[PDB]
């Protein structure tokens, strides 16, 4: 299958037509997405097979063909770009300054950009173009608007 670095749509045919359930990142031969997109199921890349390698429902992360590769972190100051890939729509960078999820175990970047659920897995980038996390796990606020964590994995 296609092991070129970049961002990819995650599609299924198990419903009416071809439906986009999420997005993910190919880097160093490993495909990175959110757990709630694939549910840890295998993936087709043409007639190549991607098998899950690592996953954790609590982090809502999953890697295919190899260990999690994405180790860049939000610096806490600079703006970032959500490289949104919405259903039926071309890839679009949306620049933003992240907010903050305050939790008992620590503080996490959050981006306040509403997009459809099928956008889950789209990467968030630093100024050097490094992936600092994925979009699509978050919360609906007082306003009824959606806020996503900057979800990043640990590298070993």
């Amino acid at each position: 299958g296609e092991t070129t670095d970049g961002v990819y749509r995650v599609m299924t045919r198990r419903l009416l037509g071809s439906t986009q359930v999420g997005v993910g990142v190919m880097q160093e031969g490993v495909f990175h997405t959110m757990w709630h997109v694939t549910k840890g199921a295998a993936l087709r890349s043409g007639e190549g097979r991607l098998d899950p390698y690592w996953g954790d429902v609590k982090q809502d992360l999953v890697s295919y063909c190899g260990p999690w590769k994405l180790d860049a972190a939000w610096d806490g100051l600079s703006e970032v770009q959500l490289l949104a890939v919405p259903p039926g729509e071309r890839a679009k960078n949306i620049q933003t300054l992240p907010g903050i999820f305050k939790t008992k175990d620590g503080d996490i970047g959050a981006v306040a950009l509403d997009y459809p659920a099928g956008t889950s897995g789209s990467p968030i980038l630093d100024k050097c173009g490094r992936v600092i996390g994925l979009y699509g796990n978050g919360v609906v606020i007082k306003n009824g608007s959606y806020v996503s964590a900057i979800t990043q994995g640990k590298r070993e």
Binding site: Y8, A41, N93, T96, G99, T103, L125, G129, V139
Partner: protein, 39 residues
């Protein structure tokens, strides 16, 4: 059965649509990986 199609390069784009706010939110994360507002 699920498949992938390439959608673009991963590049910072100088002069892109700047938008969204920066809320500080008190949240809890449960064992199912679901965020929720601690009020």
């Amino acid at each position: 059965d699920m498949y992938i199609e390439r959608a673009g390069d991963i590049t910072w784009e100088k002069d892109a649509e700047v938008t969204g706010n920066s809320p500080r939110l008190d949240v809890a994360l449960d064992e199912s990986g679901d965020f929720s507002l601690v009020e």
